[PDB]
Amino acid sequence: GGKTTSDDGIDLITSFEGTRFNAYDDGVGVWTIGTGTTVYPNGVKVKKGDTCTAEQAKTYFKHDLAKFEKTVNESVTAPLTQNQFDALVSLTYNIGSGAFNNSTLLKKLNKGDYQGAADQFLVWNKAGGKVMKGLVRRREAERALFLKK
Length: 149
Known about the structure:
Layout: H1 7-17, E1 20-25, E2 31-34, H2 54-75, H3 82-95, H4 97-101, H5 104-109, H6 114-120, E3 126-127, E4 130-131, H7 133-146
Antiparallel strand pairs: 1-2, 3-4
PDB class: antimicrobial protein
Keywords: muramidase, Lysozyme, Acinetobacter baumannii
Assembly: monomeric
């Protein structure tokens, strides 16, 4: 939109998401495949037993990535570094657009309060309503990227 996710950003998100050939349970029962895909671009939901090629996974990932880029570009009104944009997209890829849009993160960010926004990454550590240690790690990493310059 304004910005797009950098190659480094994509590599980070991919490291968090993984790239899987077989549909798998994300931990809370949501069948996921490729690089974090749960809904194919045609609207079909991922199901247990699906398989996905590398090329398919890339297509699906890039399709969803563009959605989240659009959210960050449109919803954030404060200036962003590329690192900040990348971090916010990584977060949004996980929490979704609605969660991002209604977050205290975004409220602080749009006041120009970068530090307060950075710290708000850390609240997004839940899956299935439960704190998940992989998300705790991920949020810390996204926050670090957000603060990196």
